[PDB]
Amino acid sequence: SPFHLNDAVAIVTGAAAGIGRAIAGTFAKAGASVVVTDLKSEGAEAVAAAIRQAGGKAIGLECNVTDEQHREAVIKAALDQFGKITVLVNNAGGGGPKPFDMPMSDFEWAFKLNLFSLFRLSQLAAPHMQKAGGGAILNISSMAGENTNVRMASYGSSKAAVNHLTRNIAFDVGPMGIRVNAIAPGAIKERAILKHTPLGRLGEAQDIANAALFLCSPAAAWISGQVLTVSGGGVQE
Amino acid sequence: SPFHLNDAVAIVTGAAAGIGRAIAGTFAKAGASVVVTDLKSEGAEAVAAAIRQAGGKAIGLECNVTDEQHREAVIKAALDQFGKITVLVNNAGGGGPKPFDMPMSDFEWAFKLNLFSLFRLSQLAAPHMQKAGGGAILNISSMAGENTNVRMASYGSSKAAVNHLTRNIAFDVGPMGIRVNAIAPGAIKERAILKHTPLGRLGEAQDIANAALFLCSPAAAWISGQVLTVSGGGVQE
Ligand SMILES: NC(=O)c1ccc[n+]([C@@H]2O[C@H](COP(=O)([O-])OP(=O)(O)OC[C@H]3O[C@@H](n4cnc5c(N)ncnc54)[C@H](O)[C@@H]3O)[C@@H](O)[C@H]2O)c1
Numbered sequence: 179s180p181f182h183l184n185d186a187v188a189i190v191t192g193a194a195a196g197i198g199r200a201i202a203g204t205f206a207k208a209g210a211s212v213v214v215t216d217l218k219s220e221g222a223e224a225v226a227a228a229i230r231q232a233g234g235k236a237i238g239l240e241c242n243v244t245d246e247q248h249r250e251a252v253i254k255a256a257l258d259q260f261g262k263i264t265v266l267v268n269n270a271g272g273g274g275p276k277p278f279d280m281p282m283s284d285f286e287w288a289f290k291l292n293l294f295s296l297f298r299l300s301q302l303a304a305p306h307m308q309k310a311g312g313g314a315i316l317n318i319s320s321m322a323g324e325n326t327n328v329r330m331a332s333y334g335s336s337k338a339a340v341n342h343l344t345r346n347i348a349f350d351v352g353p354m355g356i357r358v359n360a361i362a363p364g365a366i367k368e369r370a371i372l373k374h375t376p377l378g379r380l381g382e383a384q385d386i387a388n389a390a391l392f393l394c395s396p397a398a399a400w401i402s403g404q405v406l407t408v409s410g411g412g413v414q415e
Numbered sequence: 416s417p418f419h420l421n422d423a424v425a426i427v428t429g430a431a432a433g434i435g436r437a438i439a440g441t442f443a444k445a446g447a448s449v450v451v452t453d454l455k456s457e458g459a460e461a462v463a464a465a466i467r468q469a470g471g472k473a474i475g476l477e478c479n480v481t482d483e484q485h486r487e488a489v490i491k492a493a494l495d496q497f498g499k500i501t502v503l504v505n506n507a508g509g510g511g512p513k514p515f516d517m518p519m520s521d522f523e524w525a526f527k528l529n530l531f532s533l534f535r536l537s538q539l540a541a542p543h544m545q546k547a548g549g550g551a552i553l554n555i556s557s558m559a560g561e562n563t564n565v566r567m568a569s570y571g572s573s574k575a576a577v578n579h580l581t582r583n584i585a586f587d588v589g590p591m592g593i594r595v596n597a598i599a600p601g602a603i604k605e606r607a608i609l610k611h612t613p614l615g616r617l618g619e620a621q622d623i624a625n626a627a628l629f630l631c632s633p634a635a636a637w638i639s640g641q642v643l644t645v646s647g648g649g650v651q652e
């Protein structure tokens with residue numbers, strides 16, 4: 179079936195917990211060899227070890243995605259261990275509400291963490307994807323990227339930039355055989371949140387991971403440049 | 416796995432050819448009992464017979480989706496044949512370039528065919544989907560819904576209303592356990608088209624059917640109100 183990742187090699191960032199952990203484990207179960215990375219070296223090792231215990235192939239490494247030396251070490255470790263790179267999941271990111279008069283370093287950090295990092299990791303992975311005959315990049319954005327609200331100058335604008343980068347670089351890397359899509363996750367684990375969620379329950383990490391698996395699999399081979407919101411039907415961030 | 420449709424009953428409209436035919440055959444392979452419907456009675460029967468011959472469960476019926484008597488008969492036949500309805504794929508639609516000074520009968524027909532039909536079928540299916548424990552509605556839209564161009568007054572505007580209807584009614588039926596999503600196909604089957612298509616190839620019916628299966632399966636149980644464009648990375652109609 180096209181919904182598997184047979185013979186894939188997937189790098190997942192921010193994968194020690196939450197969404198990134200669920201994607202790592204789901205991708206391994208679907209047949210991918212997984213390079214599990216996280217800011218915290220022990221958290222990444224834990225998830226890679228759990229994947230190996232369950233029968234999958236995985237290694238875990240420390241990677242601060244804002245550190246160019248860490249980025250290059252992940253690319254090299256994927257190639258040394260598994261010989262190619264075909265999938266990159268840019269899940270590491272962060273931030274949140276901040277006042278309009280925030281220090282400029284806070285505003286700039288949001289772009290370094292949420293945007294400059296993945297872009298650079300996309301640059302680093304793309305030639306190896308092309309040489310492997312194609313691949314898939316997946317960016318984890320945020321519903322703040324399409325929404326408008328108070329205290330969102332840095333978080334909303336940096337995640338919107340992730341969305342627009344996704345749509346644009348699909349044109350650049352399509353001819354290399356590479357698809358690029360994004361997922362905007364909703365609230366993943368109260369009564370207030372449920373009032374704005376038509377499906378009436380909070381999201382699970384597995385919900386994001388199932389959509390990630392689709393967008394990174396051959397079942398989505400002709401889908402690129404899309405931002406898919408996984409929110410239970412809700413629109414409010 | 417979450418990408419199967421076991422014990423589902425899916426109504427697919429406009430399913431004698433093209434995208435609807437691929438959805439019907441794909442959904443049956445994934446486990447659904449399929450009610451194949453089309454304006455052309457004999458085309459729908461041929462597709463259902465091929466599904467049965469491949470080992471699936473299907474019946475074929477005539478249904479002009481613009482005819483309220485046909486819409487009621489299809490709902491009743493799905494319940495009479497399989498006892499429930501859990502998936503509705505509103506694929507029947509049409510239209511195309513028309514001059515700005517078109518007869519009003521042409522302008523209104525685009526809304527009768529592309530929008531009023533699917534709204535009514537969604538109304539008729541929804542109470543049965545709730546009694547069956549929940550369900551999924553999938554609307555087949557068009558990239559003309561979000562694009563802007565000449566000669567698009569009726570086709571572009573009516574397909575855009577489908578996109579917005581999808582997002583809005585997800586709020587209404589979410590509490591009934593029903594998800595509503597749309598797929599906007601691009602160029603599904605030249606040099607000019609490929610020039611604006613990053614992935615370098617024309618779209619196939621099976622590309623739409625693979626996305627349809629994802630969005631109607633438990634793998635997308637917390638995805639609603641989305642419009643997924645399947646276009647090879649392209650943005651132009
Ligand atoms: N606003 C929203 O709607 C929303 C909601 C949830 C998640 N998200 C996005 O999803 C992604 C994952 O978030 P989450 O909620 O699962 O986070 P989480 O806190 O559950 O886990 C994040 C993981 O990433 C790691 N990490 C943090 N900074 C890092 C860095 N610089 N380099 C590498 N790894 C790092 C952490 O150690 C942690 O293990 C993020 O991009 C986040 O912005 C957005």
Ligand SMILES: NC(=O)c1ccc[n+]([C@@H]2O[C@H](COP(=O)([O-])OP(=O)(O)OC[C@H]3O[C@@H](n4cnc5c(N)ncnc54)[C@H](O)[C@@H]3O)[C@@H](O)[C@H]2O)c1
Pocket residue numbers: 428429430431432433434435452453454455458478479480481506507508509510528555556557558559599600601602603
């Ligand atoms: N604009 C785009 O980019 C684009 C491209 C492809 C498809 N689409 C959409 O996808 C859907 C299917 O398109 P396709 O290319 O597979 O069409 P198709 O011509 O291959 O087949 C469509 C089927 O629908 C049936 N049909 C026509 N009118 C009907 C009616 N009133 N009631 C019931 N059935 C009817 C036909 O008999 C035919 O079997 C349509 O909604 C179409 O608008 C849009």
